[PDB]
Amino acid sequence: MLGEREKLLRLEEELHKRVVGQDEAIRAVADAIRRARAGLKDPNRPIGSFLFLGPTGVGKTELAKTLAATLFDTEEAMIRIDMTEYMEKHAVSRLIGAPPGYVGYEEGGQLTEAVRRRPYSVILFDAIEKAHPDVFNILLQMLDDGRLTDSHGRTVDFRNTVIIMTSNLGSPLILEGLQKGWPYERIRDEVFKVLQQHFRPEFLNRLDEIVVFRPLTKEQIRQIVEIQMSYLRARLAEKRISLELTEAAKDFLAERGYDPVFGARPLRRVIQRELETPLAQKILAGEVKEGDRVQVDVGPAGLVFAVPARV
Ligand SMILES: Nc1ncnc2c1ncn2[C@@H]1O[C@H](COP(=O)(O)OP(=O)(O)O)[C@@H](O)[C@H]1O
């Protein structure tokens, strides 16, 4: 391997393309993967296993998707599992395959059937704490064996997955860590204390890395707005239309589009509502014709749209 190497030394850059900010989190991930490809990790255990602590809407899933895409060359190459739907006893059977003579037997269990059909992939468990403690045991086994045994007794190979578990447990106490005093590492410490209270220490050690996601800064969110309206620019390029934003215009979209409790979840449909909707209005009315560079500024009733007349 030579080109596969080149991609790994430049790995962080490849991820920052799609994931703004969260640099600490990205070293963390990228490192663990270098230790894999170098061959310093136990080869009968998955490429990497992570705990993603932190607020919602600030990059967890994105990184998950991005990683998947930059490692296995597609967003499809990742499996999302929601621990909210696994709070029951009945859960275990849906995860790996309900015992014979059961509704969802031969149709398999979606986890084991996904990994079975796609052995090199990223796997995302959301709200790992919401999981029924039975389901944990199944995960732990997998974390040590790189193997799981489904209902039909067929053994499923996880030695080529990256495992990522998100949880919001820390969050209300990384808010105190946001307030400077607790910088790079001290948060990753004071959180461990709360983690021990919810998670057994056998579990917190199969884990390759515990990663703290921080909230976003205005300038960061501003960047996300750009990446966020990439498809639209491309869409508009087909009719040769440009979209200069203003400093304030970006800030407006950022203002409306970042809920603290939800991060940038709302953003995409804010952009859609505040910028795409009125832009369609203009385009259809003819105030924007094929060719124009449209300028976009803030006002009292939201975004306002300027076109230079013809030279
Ligand atoms: N750091 C980031 N880099 C790029 N996009 C981000 C970032 N943080 C949030 N987003 C945007 O927020 C949206 C959803 O966020 P998500 O990945 O679900 O965060 P979480 O998993 O914490 O809920 C995505 O469209 C994504 O583009």
Short mmCIF file of C-alpha atoms and ligand atoms in Angstrom, two decimals:
data_model
loop_
_atom_site.label_atom_id
_atom_site.label_comp_id
_atom_site.label_asym_id
_atom_site.label_seq_id
_atom_site.Cartn_x
_atom_site.Cartn_y
_atom_site.Cartn_z
CA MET A 1 0.00 0.00 0.00
CA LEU A 2 1.17 3.53 -0.90
CA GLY A 3 -1.95 5.54 -1.77
CA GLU A 4 -3.91 4.02 1.11
CA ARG A 5 -1.07 5.30 3.31
CA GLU A 6 -1.18 8.85 1.84
CA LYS A 7 -4.93 8.96 2.68
CA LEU A 8 -4.26 8.07 6.35
CA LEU A 9 -1.54 10.65 7.06
CA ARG A 10 -3.85 13.23 5.51
CA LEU A 11 -6.87 11.74 7.27
CA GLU A 12 -7.87 14.70 9.43
CA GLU A 13 -7.93 17.02 6.42
CA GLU A 14 -10.20 14.55 4.62
CA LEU A 15 -12.67 14.71 7.51
CA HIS A 16 -12.57 18.45 8.09
CA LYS A 17 -13.87 18.81 4.53
CA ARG A 18 -17.30 17.72 5.75
CA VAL A 19 -16.92 18.26 9.48
CA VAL A 20 -16.33 21.81 10.64
CA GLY A 21 -14.69 22.28 14.07
CA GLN A 22 -14.40 19.54 16.71
CA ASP A 23 -10.66 19.20 16.06
CA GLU A 24 -9.94 17.35 19.35
CA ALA A 25 -12.60 14.80 18.43
CA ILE A 26 -11.04 14.30 15.02
CA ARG A 27 -7.46 13.70 16.18
CA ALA A 28 -9.00 11.23 18.60
CA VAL A 29 -10.70 9.28 15.83
CA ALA A 30 -7.94 9.59 13.23
CA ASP A 31 -5.32 8.38 15.71
CA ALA A 32 -7.20 5.20 16.67
CA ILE A 33 -7.40 4.35 12.97
CA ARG A 34 -3.67 4.84 12.40
CA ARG A 35 -3.00 2.47 15.27
CA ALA A 36 -5.22 0.01 13.42
CA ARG A 37 -3.50 0.26 10.02
CA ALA A 38 -0.08 0.31 11.67
CA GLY A 39 -1.00 -2.90 13.49
CA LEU A 40 -0.77 -1.92 17.16
CA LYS A 41 -4.34 -2.96 17.98
CA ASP A 42 -5.59 -6.47 18.80
CA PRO A 43 -6.65 -7.71 15.33
CA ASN A 44 -9.58 -9.76 16.72
CA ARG A 45 -11.29 -6.59 17.86
CA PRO A 46 -13.04 -3.99 15.64
CA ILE A 47 -10.96 -1.25 13.89
CA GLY A 48 -12.13 1.28 16.46
CA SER A 49 -14.73 1.70 19.20
CA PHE A 50 -15.80 5.13 20.42
CA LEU A 51 -17.96 6.88 22.90
CA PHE A 52 -19.25 10.16 21.48
CA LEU A 53 -20.27 12.38 24.40
CA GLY A 54 -21.48 15.93 23.96
CA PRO A 55 -24.48 18.01 22.85
CA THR A 56 -26.79 17.27 19.91
CA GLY A 57 -26.46 18.74 16.42
CA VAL A 58 -22.74 19.53 16.65
CA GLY A 59 -21.21 16.82 14.44
CA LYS A 60 -21.49 13.34 15.98
CA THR A 61 -23.55 11.74 13.20
CA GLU A 62 -21.74 13.88 10.61
CA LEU A 63 -18.37 12.53 11.64
CA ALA A 64 -19.92 9.05 11.68
CA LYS A 65 -21.19 9.54 8.14
CA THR A 66 -18.07 11.37 6.97
CA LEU A 67 -15.76 8.77 8.43
CA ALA A 68 -17.80 6.03 6.79
CA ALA A 69 -17.60 7.89 3.49
CA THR A 70 -13.85 8.63 3.70
CA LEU A 71 -12.87 5.12 4.77
CA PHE A 72 -15.25 2.89 2.86
CA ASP A 73 -16.10 5.36 0.06
CA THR A 74 -19.85 5.88 0.64
CA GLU A 75 -22.40 7.21 3.16
CA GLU A 76 -24.33 3.94 2.68
CA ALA A 77 -21.40 2.15 4.32
CA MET A 78 -22.74 2.82 7.79
CA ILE A 79 -25.42 1.30 9.97
CA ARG A 80 -27.43 3.32 12.45
CA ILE A 81 -29.11 1.68 15.42
CA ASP A 82 -31.26 3.61 17.87
CA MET A 83 -31.01 2.32 21.46
CA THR A 84 -34.40 3.93 22.16
CA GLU A 85 -36.04 1.01 20.35
CA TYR A 86 -34.08 -1.45 22.52
CA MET A 87 -35.30 -0.82 26.06
CA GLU A 88 -37.20 -4.12 26.24
CA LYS A 89 -36.34 -7.82 26.64
CA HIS A 90 -37.82 -8.42 23.16
CA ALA A 91 -35.03 -6.11 21.94
CA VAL A 92 -32.10 -8.56 21.96
CA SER A 93 -34.06 -10.76 19.56
CA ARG A 94 -34.54 -7.87 17.09
CA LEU A 95 -30.85 -7.00 17.28
CA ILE A 96 -29.40 -10.40 16.42
CA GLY A 97 -32.38 -12.46 15.26
CA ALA A 98 -35.34 -13.70 17.27
CA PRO A 99 -35.09 -17.41 18.20
CA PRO A 100 -36.57 -19.91 15.69
CA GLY A 101 -40.33 -19.88 15.13
CA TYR A 102 -40.50 -16.21 15.62
CA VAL A 103 -41.94 -13.42 13.53
CA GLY A 104 -38.53 -11.94 12.64
CA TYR A 105 -36.45 -15.12 12.51
CA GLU A 106 -35.33 -15.95 8.95
CA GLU A 107 -35.56 -12.27 7.99
CA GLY A 108 -32.70 -12.01 10.51
CA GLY A 109 -31.82 -9.36 13.06
CA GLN A 110 -31.07 -6.01 11.44
CA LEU A 111 -27.68 -5.55 13.19
CA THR A 112 -26.26 -8.98 12.40
CA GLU A 113 -27.87 -8.88 8.94
CA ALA A 114 -26.39 -5.48 8.15
CA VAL A 115 -22.86 -6.36 9.26
CA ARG A 116 -23.30 -9.79 7.67
CA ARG A 117 -24.07 -8.15 4.31
CA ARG A 118 -21.64 -5.23 4.89
CA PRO A 119 -18.58 -6.26 7.01
CA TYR A 120 -16.48 -3.13 6.36
CA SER A 121 -18.65 -0.33 7.71
CA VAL A 122 -19.24 2.23 10.43
CA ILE A 123 -21.94 1.43 12.98
CA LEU A 124 -23.77 4.03 14.99
CA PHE A 125 -25.65 3.31 18.21
CA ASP A 126 -27.57 6.36 19.39
CA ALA A 127 -28.44 6.87 23.05
CA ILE A 128 -26.41 3.86 24.22
CA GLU A 129 -27.58 4.47 27.82
CA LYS A 130 -31.26 3.99 26.81
CA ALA A 131 -30.39 0.39 25.91
CA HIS A 132 -31.72 -2.54 27.95
CA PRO A 133 -28.73 -3.96 29.91
CA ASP A 134 -29.21 -7.33 28.16
CA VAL A 135 -28.43 -5.67 24.83
CA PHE A 136 -25.20 -4.37 26.42
CA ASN A 137 -23.86 -7.90 27.02
CA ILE A 138 -24.32 -8.65 23.33
CA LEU A 139 -22.37 -5.47 22.46
CA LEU A 140 -19.58 -6.17 24.93
CA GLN A 141 -19.10 -9.67 23.50
CA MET A 142 -18.80 -8.13 20.06
CA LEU A 143 -16.35 -5.50 21.35
CA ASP A 144 -14.00 -8.26 22.51
CA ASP A 145 -14.60 -10.97 19.95
CA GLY A 146 -15.03 -8.87 16.84
CA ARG A 147 -17.63 -11.60 16.49
CA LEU A 148 -21.27 -12.07 17.31
CA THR A 149 -23.51 -15.13 16.95
CA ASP A 150 -26.95 -14.54 15.50
CA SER A 151 -30.09 -16.59 16.01
CA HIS A 152 -29.34 -19.07 13.19
CA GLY A 153 -25.95 -19.66 14.82
CA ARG A 154 -24.07 -17.99 11.96
CA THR A 155 -21.16 -15.99 13.33
CA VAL A 156 -20.93 -12.39 12.18
CA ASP A 157 -17.56 -10.66 11.75
CA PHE A 158 -17.07 -7.19 13.23
CA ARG A 159 -13.30 -7.07 12.97
CA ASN A 160 -13.69 -4.59 10.12
CA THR A 161 -16.23 -2.18 11.57
CA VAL A 162 -15.73 1.03 13.46
CA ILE A 163 -18.19 1.17 16.34
CA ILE A 164 -19.50 4.52 17.53
CA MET A 165 -21.84 4.95 20.46
CA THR A 166 -23.35 8.37 21.08
CA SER A 167 -24.84 9.49 24.39
CA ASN A 168 -25.98 12.81 25.80
CA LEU A 169 -25.16 11.89 29.42
CA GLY A 170 -22.27 14.31 29.86
CA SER A 171 -23.85 17.29 28.05
CA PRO A 172 -25.52 19.21 30.97
CA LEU A 173 -22.03 19.15 32.55
CA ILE A 174 -19.93 20.06 29.50
CA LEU A 175 -21.91 23.32 29.60
CA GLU A 176 -19.85 24.08 32.71
CA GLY A 177 -16.79 22.98 30.72
CA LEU A 178 -17.68 25.33 27.88
CA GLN A 179 -17.20 28.19 30.37
CA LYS A 180 -13.45 28.24 29.63
CA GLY A 181 -11.90 27.04 32.93
CA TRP A 182 -12.09 23.40 31.84
CA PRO A 183 -10.25 23.28 28.48
CA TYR A 184 -8.85 20.54 26.19
CA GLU A 185 -8.71 17.63 28.66
CA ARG A 186 -10.21 18.53 32.07
CA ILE A 187 -13.70 18.06 30.61
CA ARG A 188 -12.75 14.57 29.30
CA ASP A 189 -11.86 13.92 32.97
CA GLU A 190 -14.79 15.38 34.98
CA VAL A 191 -17.14 13.54 32.59
CA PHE A 192 -15.47 10.16 33.29
CA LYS A 193 -16.76 10.53 36.87
CA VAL A 194 -20.37 10.74 35.64
CA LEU A 195 -19.73 7.93 33.14
CA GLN A 196 -18.66 5.53 35.90
CA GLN A 197 -21.98 6.18 37.64
CA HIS A 198 -23.91 5.09 34.52
CA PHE A 199 -21.49 2.61 32.93
CA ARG A 200 -19.55 -0.34 34.31
CA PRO A 201 -15.73 0.06 34.15
CA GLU A 202 -15.33 -3.22 32.18
CA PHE A 203 -17.23 -1.47 29.41
CA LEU A 204 -15.37 1.87 29.57
CA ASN A 205 -12.15 0.01 28.81
CA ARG A 206 -13.03 -1.98 25.72
CA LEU A 207 -13.50 1.55 24.38
CA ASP A 208 -10.71 2.86 22.18
CA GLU A 209 -11.44 6.49 22.92
CA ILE A 210 -13.87 8.67 24.78
CA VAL A 211 -14.46 11.78 22.71
CA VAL A 212 -16.00 15.07 23.82
CA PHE A 213 -17.88 17.11 21.25
CA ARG A 214 -18.03 20.81 22.06
CA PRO A 215 -20.75 23.29 21.04
CA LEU A 216 -20.21 25.44 18.01
CA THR A 217 -18.94 29.00 17.65
CA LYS A 218 -20.60 31.65 15.41
CA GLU A 219 -17.74 31.47 12.90
CA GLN A 220 -18.04 27.68 12.86
CA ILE A 221 -21.82 27.71 12.29
CA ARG A 222 -21.19 30.30 9.57
CA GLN A 223 -18.94 27.74 7.84
CA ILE A 224 -21.60 25.04 8.17
CA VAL A 225 -24.09 27.37 6.44
CA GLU A 226 -21.73 27.42 3.46
CA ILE A 227 -21.29 23.64 3.24
CA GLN A 228 -25.04 23.46 3.88
CA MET A 229 -25.95 25.48 0.79
CA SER A 230 -23.56 23.70 -1.55
CA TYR A 231 -26.26 21.77 -3.42
CA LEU A 232 -28.21 25.01 -3.95
CA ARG A 233 -25.22 26.86 -5.46
CA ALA A 234 -24.66 23.86 -7.75
CA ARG A 235 -28.36 23.79 -8.53
CA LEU A 236 -28.22 27.51 -9.36
CA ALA A 237 -25.00 27.14 -11.40
CA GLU A 238 -27.03 25.23 -14.02
CA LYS A 239 -28.74 28.53 -14.87
CA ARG A 240 -25.48 30.47 -14.27
CA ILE A 241 -26.67 32.19 -11.09
CA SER A 242 -24.36 33.29 -8.29
CA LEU A 243 -25.05 33.85 -4.62
CA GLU A 244 -22.92 36.38 -2.78
CA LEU A 245 -23.93 36.47 0.86
CA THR A 246 -23.31 39.31 3.29
CA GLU A 247 -21.53 38.99 6.61
CA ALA A 248 -24.82 39.72 8.39
CA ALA A 249 -26.85 37.46 6.08
CA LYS A 250 -24.77 34.44 7.13
CA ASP A 251 -25.11 35.56 10.74
CA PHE A 252 -28.89 35.80 10.31
CA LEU A 253 -29.09 32.24 9.02
CA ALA A 254 -26.80 31.19 11.85
CA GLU A 255 -28.90 33.12 14.40
CA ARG A 256 -32.16 31.43 13.41
CA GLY A 257 -30.56 28.07 12.62
CA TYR A 258 -28.75 27.12 15.82
CA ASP A 259 -30.86 26.04 18.74
CA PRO A 260 -28.61 25.32 21.75
CA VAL A 261 -30.63 22.23 22.71
CA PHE A 262 -30.52 20.97 19.09
CA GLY A 263 -27.35 22.45 17.56
CA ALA A 264 -27.61 22.77 13.77
CA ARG A 265 -30.44 20.22 13.29
CA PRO A 266 -32.90 23.02 12.36
CA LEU A 267 -30.44 24.80 10.06
CA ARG A 268 -31.11 23.01 6.77
CA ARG A 269 -34.81 23.85 6.73
CA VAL A 270 -34.14 27.36 8.01
CA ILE A 271 -31.89 27.98 5.00
CA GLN A 272 -34.68 26.50 2.92
CA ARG A 273 -37.34 28.72 4.45
CA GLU A 274 -35.36 31.97 4.74
CA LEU A 275 -33.30 31.86 1.55
CA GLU A 276 -34.54 29.21 -0.89
CA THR A 277 -38.25 30.06 -0.58
CA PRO A 278 -37.86 33.81 -1.29
CA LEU A 279 -35.30 33.00 -3.97
CA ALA A 280 -37.83 30.79 -5.78
CA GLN A 281 -40.27 33.70 -5.52
CA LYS A 282 -37.76 35.95 -7.24
CA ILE A 283 -36.79 33.40 -9.92
CA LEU A 284 -40.40 32.67 -10.89
CA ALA A 285 -41.37 36.36 -10.83
CA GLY A 286 -38.41 36.98 -13.14
CA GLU A 287 -36.58 39.41 -10.82
CA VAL A 288 -33.76 36.85 -11.13
CA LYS A 289 -32.96 35.83 -14.73
CA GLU A 290 -30.45 33.38 -16.14
CA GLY A 291 -26.98 34.86 -15.57
CA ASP A 292 -27.23 37.17 -12.51
CA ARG A 293 -24.99 37.27 -9.47
CA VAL A 294 -27.61 37.69 -6.75
CA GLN A 295 -26.54 39.53 -3.62
CA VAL A 296 -28.19 38.65 -0.32
CA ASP A 297 -28.43 40.92 2.74
CA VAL A 298 -30.39 41.19 6.02
CA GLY A 299 -33.38 43.38 6.68
CA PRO A 300 -36.36 43.84 8.98
CA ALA A 301 -38.46 41.11 7.30
CA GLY A 302 -35.49 38.76 6.92
CA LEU A 303 -33.26 38.28 3.90
CA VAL A 304 -33.32 40.81 1.08
CA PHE A 305 -32.21 40.21 -2.50
CA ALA A 306 -30.16 42.55 -4.69
CA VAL A 307 -29.30 42.25 -8.39
CA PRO A 308 -26.86 44.55 -10.19
CA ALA A 309 -28.50 45.86 -13.38
CA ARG A 310 -26.79 45.24 -16.76
CA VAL A 311 -23.39 46.94 -17.44
N1 LIG B 1 -19.10 19.95 12.87
C1 LIG B 1 -19.95 19.88 11.83
N2 LIG B 1 -19.52 19.83 10.55
C2 LIG B 1 -20.38 19.75 9.53
N3 LIG B 1 -21.72 19.70 9.69
C3 LIG B 1 -22.29 19.73 10.92
C4 LIG B 1 -21.40 19.82 12.08
N4 LIG B 1 -22.19 19.84 13.16
C5 LIG B 1 -23.47 19.76 12.73
N5 LIG B 1 -23.54 19.70 11.40
C6 LIG B 1 -24.79 19.61 10.62
O1 LIG B 1 -25.91 19.32 11.46
C7 LIG B 1 -26.79 18.39 10.82
C8 LIG B 1 -27.22 17.25 11.74
O2 LIG B 1 -26.28 17.06 12.81
P1 LIG B 1 -25.90 15.60 13.40
O3 LIG B 1 -24.73 15.05 12.61
O4 LIG B 1 -27.15 14.75 13.55
O5 LIG B 1 -25.37 15.99 14.86
P2 LIG B 1 -25.71 15.01 16.09
O6 LIG B 1 -25.44 13.60 15.63
O7 LIG B 1 -25.02 15.57 17.32
O8 LIG B 1 -27.31 15.17 16.31
C9 LIG B 1 -26.08 17.84 9.60
O9 LIG B 1 -26.74 18.28 8.42
C10 LIG B 1 -24.70 18.45 9.64
O10 LIG B 1 -24.24 18.87 8.34
#
